[PDB]
RNA sequence: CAGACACCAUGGUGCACCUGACUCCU
RNA sequence: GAAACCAAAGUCUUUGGGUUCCGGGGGGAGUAUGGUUGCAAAGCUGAAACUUAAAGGAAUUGACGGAAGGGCACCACCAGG
RNA sequence: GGGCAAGUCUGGUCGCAGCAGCCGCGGUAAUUCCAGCUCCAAUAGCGUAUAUUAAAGUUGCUGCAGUUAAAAAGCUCGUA
């Protein structure tokens, strides 16, 4: 804890509330925009695209098989 | 330095003690011959560390009681011997030197004696 | 083809008293809050509804001289469903030897819990009378009366402890460690015995301050010692 | 009371509590022994209240008195010097003499050498009688202790200020409390002292 | 300072009650103080009180019974219109079978169950159960 | 990595089969479904009988 | 602790105490009573009946119960020199 | 497992020993190699007396 | 946490002091966080006193002592075992052993 | 207490696994 | 209180003395970016992509130590054959 | 396979193919695959994706934490 309170500190909370809330990871990047910039979904429930390639991917270890992805 | 007598003739052999220090003796041949009488060992060997610390035991016990082994005709023989008079609780204290507030207390009880005094050299008790 | 049985001794003025029809129940020493370590005092008064929940036969273990060493840290907990509910704690190197360890450590555990009523003041209790709280490693377990109807809002194993208390209307919010349920029940099991703790005015009555059966007795406690 | 005269502390109780240094008490600051203090000496040696003493030796043996047994009363001397007195405490009253080591679990302990089923433990000294006093705490067991002005309190009822403490002063008091109750219960009875003195008592001081 | 003089003698007489102690000096002696000490030994959670009359703030001296579990401040105070002061007794009380709120109100600094049979409200002081 | 060579799809799938079972008596559907999982699990005989199962438990 | 007016709700009422005011509860430890024989008035052979007072171990592990025993049997009688 | 060595373990104590002991020994639950001590009253392994004193099979 | 509640030696009632080096290593420690010593020893030492004393003539004087004060580092304190590891509830310890 | 104290690098992998009942019918 | 420990690291779920300051798993990173000072050295304000189901804390138990203190064996020494 | 209800099934596969939100199976006597079968679940829906609300007292106004896990500025005056 820790903090003022009296009775004009309404104008303190709304201040101090949503600041030490865009330290939180997920208020963040949510707010930046940076989920629909950096990933194409955020802004899509689903998105159609044409395969560029099949790729056939060896798993990093663990869980030794092969992925077999698409991009 | 070796073969130590453990747990099994200690505890065998205090028993034997309290119960036949009568028919016990100090010879190992007869408390050998006697724990073959009144006990059930089964070796001789065993027989003789046992009888051979009951020597070892009588040989302290007819010393009075020793650590960790008693006989109640010592036992109750030292309370015969505690019905010791080492006073009456009347010296006579009456009057006699005192504390002042014990005086007090005395004051407080009607009957007073002498009182020290003089708080020289403090601490009184240094 | 296998059969129990059972042999009563006493240990304790108590359990003469006991199993004399002298003390004729818990509430007794529950009022006279004297101990017990007859489990079989529990048994000689109630011995039905008493129900057994093994909670968690967790493996704990210490690493040794050679290699490991672990053991089975079983928790049983027994309540009849009536205001009394008891909990052990067993660390044994089997599961049932765990188990019916902390059977009989349940069994002699028992303590009463003290239901109420949440805004009402007739029906033969249904909840606390006081909102009550405990905490065991930082897992605080909050308990909120309910009225009638509503149920036991709880995660499943505060659920099970309320119900067998008989407390059957009440409302939970708990913050701490989310996965070491163990010190969740043992958290839940502070607030249970808070229930008497708390005082109402209704327990603003005061009492006679009773006069110790052992010396009420210890002329009838004259069996081989007083 | 009953007979309140001798009750009310007579000359042959007032000295020998000056002749067992009963009034004296250490010199250790106290907050629940403070009251039973009567005076301090030069630069601190505290005179105890024998008033403080009489009336707590009253009522901890009307305590120990209309229990119907002495057998549920364990008495505890640790202290060598009171274990002969609770021999001859045990001699008189007929109470549970516990001399020496408590030997930890006789209150505790279903598996054990030992279990005994006191209702008051009476003690010369609750530091040097703590382990009684742990397993006095452990399973519902009153305690009076013989208290001075160093002694612990914690867990400690009805507590009779004494010297108590090396001196004939624990012997004294065991002389008195065989006593009081003798005095209640006994054929010293209708509140008369006794006619045995404390040299059925005092410690042994081994002898020639 | 003392900003709040009720929350520096709450404190004084929980740790009183903690203690089980039967005396406090409390200062620097409101009325507001003395009307929640008024209302309170009213309903036997305590004793009587004793004030002592010094010119610098004075002190009371209150002997305290062990029938309260709980006295708390609304540390600062709020505007209550008669509709959020169940949701104190919701949040705040144990149940709605006991606990009182006291507030001052403009009928007199009054408990919760007054200021509901007059309906006329004010700010709230704090609780006690 | 940076790899990306497929090796084997549908390896183990060609070597594992499949049949079919027919329906005795129906697949019930619904209504007298549901039913039925009530009445069948406990009134047939009533349960007298057993302990330590699940449904379809070799446990 | 009762329900309404005849009704009984708890299972059974717990003890108290004089010192701190406070309850002994289920199976609380080192909380008991305090049995003190009301000897006779000097025709003296003690008249029966003792004097109780329950005594919580809160006040015993405060250390506590010397005085309130003695704010309870100096305070409320019988004892000689008081 | 358990409730057999709880069955015959009772039993050959029923019947009376000093000391009596149930070993399963060897692989169960797939390849590895487990250990079923089921022991009841007094076992000693002292010297010359362990081959006296016990039935073994 | 705090291994060491004093962290050597105290430094409360004082906001900042002065260091030291170590008397066997040169090693920079301040001078209440250190270990220091005091040595009262003869300059006559027993080795020397058998031969000494008795070719001591005209010397009715006594045996000198010499008065050194010395302080080390802990580094070298613990590896010579000026100090050395005691126990955690030994650590609580402010006792030196007597000389 | 109170005589003499050198450098010495590296190094690696699977199984500790979640419940109760006793109609051997003698 | 997670314990460590702490009359404070108490008077908290029975949650509120007042006022200020700061954290939201772990990074990337006080790096980028701009501000900013400082003679400079550097100081200060202060990210993202991406990376992750763990990171961390006490405490128990081992094991280890060019950590320390104990005992014993010619599978270890000594004296030796 | 657990979480998570209902296969310590039956076969195959053998760290492969795959599966697996997470914890995880598969390196041969696979309860994680792939299927069969059996069971469970809801049900004319059910499942997924993404989104957001709670759960979350992990933004804590109620009601967070800041010695050692994140978190008292180097310290002080000192205005708002």
Redesign the interface.
């Known amino acids: 804890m820790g903090k003022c309170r009296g009775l004009r500190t309404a104008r303190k909370l709304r201040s101090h509330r949503r600041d030490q809330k865009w330290h939180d990871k997920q208020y963040k990047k949510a707010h930046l925009g940076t989920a629909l910039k950096a990933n194409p979904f955020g802004g899509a429930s689903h998105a159609k695209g044409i395969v560029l390639e099949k790729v056939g991917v060896e798993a990093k270890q663990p869980n030794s098989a092969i992925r077999k992805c698409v991009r | 330095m070796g073969r130590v007598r453990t747990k099994t003739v200690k505890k065998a052999a205090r028993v034997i003690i309290e119960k036949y220090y009568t028919r016990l003796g100090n010879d190992f041949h007869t408390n050998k011959r006697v724990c073959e009488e009144i006990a059930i060992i089964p070796s001789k060997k065993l027989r003789n560390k046992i009888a051979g610390y009951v020597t070892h035991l009588m040989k302290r016990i007819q010393r009075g009681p020793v650590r960790g082994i008693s006989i109640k005709l010592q036992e109750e023989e030292r309370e015969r011997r505690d019905n010791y008079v080492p006073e009456v609780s009347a010296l006579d204290q009456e009057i006699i030197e005192v504390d002042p507030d014990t005086k007090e207390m005395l004051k407080l009880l009607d009957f007073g004696s002498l009182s020290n005094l003089q708080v020289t050299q403090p601490t009184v008790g240094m | 083809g ?1 059969a129990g049985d059972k042999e009563w001794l006493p ?3 108590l359990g003469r008293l006991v199993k004399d029809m002298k003390i004729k129940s818990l ?1 007794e ?9 007859e489990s079989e005092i529990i048994d000689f008064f109630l011995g039905a509804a008493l129900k057994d929940k093994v909670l968690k036969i967790m493996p704990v273990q210490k690493q040794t001289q050679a290699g490991q060493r672990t053991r089975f840290k079983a928790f049983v907990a027994i309540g009849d469903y009536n ?2 509910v008891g909990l052990g704690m067993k660390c044994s190197k089997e599961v ?1 030897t765990a188990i019916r360890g902390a059977i009989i450590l349940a069994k002699l555990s028992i ?2 819990v ?6 009402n ?5 249904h909840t606390v ?3 009550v709280t405990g905490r065991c490693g930082s897992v605080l377990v909050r308990l909120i ?1 309910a009225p009638r109807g509503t149920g036991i809002i709880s995660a499943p194993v505060p659920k099970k402890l309320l119900l067998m208390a008989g407390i059957d209307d009440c409302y939970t919010s708990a913050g701490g460690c989310t996965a070491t349920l163990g010190n969740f029940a043992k958290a839940t099991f502070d607030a249970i ?1 808070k229930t ?9 009555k ?7 059966p ?2 009420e007795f ?2 009838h406690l ?1 069996k081989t ?2 | 009371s009953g007979a309140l005269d001798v009750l009310q502390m007579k000359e042959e109780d007032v000295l020998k509590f000056l002749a067992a240094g009963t009034h004296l008490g250490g010199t250790n600051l106290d907050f629940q022994m403070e009251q039973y203090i009567y005076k301090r000496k030069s630069d601190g040696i505290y005179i105890i209240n024998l008033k403080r003493t009489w009336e707590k030796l009253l009522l901890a043996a009307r305590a120990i008195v ?4 002495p ?2 009363v364990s008495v505890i001397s640790s202290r060598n010097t009171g274990q002969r007195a609770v021999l001859k405490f045990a001699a008189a009253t007929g109470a549970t003499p516990i001399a020496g080591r408590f030997t930890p679990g006789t209150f505790t302990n ?1 598996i054990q050498a030992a ?1 005994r ?1 006191p ?1 008051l433990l009476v003690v010369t000294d609750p530091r040097a009688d703590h382990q009684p006093l742990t397993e006095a705490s ?3 067991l009153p305690t009076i202790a013989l208290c001075n002005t160093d002694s612990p309190l914690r867990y400690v009822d009805i507590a009779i200020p004494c010297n108590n403490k090396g001196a004939h002063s624990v012997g004294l008091m065991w002389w008195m409390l065989a006593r009081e109750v003798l005095r209640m219960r006994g054929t010293i009875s209708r509140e008369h002292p006794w006619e045995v003195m404390p040299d059925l008592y005092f410690y042994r001081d081994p002898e020639e | 300072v003392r900003m709040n003089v009720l929350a520096d003698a709450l404190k004084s007489i929980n740790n009183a009650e903690k203690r089980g102690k039967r005396q406090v000096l409390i200062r620097p002696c409101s009325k507001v103080i003395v009307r929640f000490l008024t209302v309170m030994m009213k309903h ?1 959670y305590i004793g009587e009180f004793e004030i002592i009359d010094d010119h610098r703030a004075g002190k009371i001296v209150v002997n305290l019974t ?2 309260l ?1 709980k006295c708390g401040v609304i540390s600062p105070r709020f505007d209550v219109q008669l509709k959020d002061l169940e949701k104190w007794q919701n949040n705040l009380l ?5 606990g009182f709120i006291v507030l001052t109100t403009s009928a007199g600094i009054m408990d919760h169950e007054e200021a509901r049979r007059k309906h006329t409200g004010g700010k709230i002081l704090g609780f006690f159960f | 990595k940076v790899h990306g060579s497929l090796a084997r799809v549908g390896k183990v799938r060609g070597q594992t089969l499949k049949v079919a079972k027919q329906e005795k008596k129906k697949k019930r559907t619904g209504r007298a479904k549901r039913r039925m999982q009530y009445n069948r699990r406990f009134v047939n005989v009533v349960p007298t009988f057993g302990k330590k199962k699940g449904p379809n438990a070799n446990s | ?4 007016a005849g ?1 009984f ?8 105490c004089s010192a701190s005011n ?8 080192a ?3 305090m ?1 003190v024989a009301e000897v006779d008035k000097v025709t003296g052979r003690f008249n029966g009946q ?1 004097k ?3 005594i919580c171990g809160a006040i015993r592990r405060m250390g506590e119960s010397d005085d309130s025993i003695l704010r309870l049997a100096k305070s409320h009688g019988i004892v000689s020199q008081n | 497992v ?1 409730r057999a060595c709880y ?1 015959v373990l ?1 039993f050959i104590m029923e019947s009376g020993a000093k000391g009596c002991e149930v070993v399963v020994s060897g692989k169960l639950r797939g390849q590895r190699a487990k250990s079923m001590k089921f022991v009841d009253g007094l076992m000693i392994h002292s010297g010359d007396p362990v081959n006296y004193y016990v039935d073994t099979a | 946490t705090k291994k060491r509640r004093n962290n050597g030696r105290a430094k409360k009632g004082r906001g900042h002091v002065q260091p030291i080096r170590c008397t066997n290593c040169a090693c920079c420690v301040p001078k209440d966080k250190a270990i220091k010593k005091f040595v009262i020893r003869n300059i006559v030492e027993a080795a020397a006193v058998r031969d000494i004393s008795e070719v001591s003539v005209f010397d009715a004087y006594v045996l000198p002592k010499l008065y050194v004060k010395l302080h080390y580092c802990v580094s070298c304190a613990i590896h010579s075992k000026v100090v050395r590891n005691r126990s955690r509830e030994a650590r609580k310890d402010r006792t030196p052993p007597p000389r």
């Open positions: 296998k240990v304790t003025k509430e020493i529950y009022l006279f809050s004297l101990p017990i370590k205001g009394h049932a303590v009463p003290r239901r109420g009523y949440w805004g003041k007739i029906g033969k209790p009378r006081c909102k009366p015995s008497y703790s708390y005082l109402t005015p209704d327990l603003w005061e009492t006679v301050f009773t006069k110790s052992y010396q210890t002329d004259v010692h007083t | 209309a229990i119907e047994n057998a549920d279903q279990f089923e209702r452990y399973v519902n | 036997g062990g029938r579990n144990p149940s709605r079978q006991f | 602790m009762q329900s309404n009704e709700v708890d299972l059974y009422v717990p003890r108290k406070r309850i002994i509860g289920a199976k609380d430890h909380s008991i009573p049995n003792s109780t007072y329950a | 358990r069955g009772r």
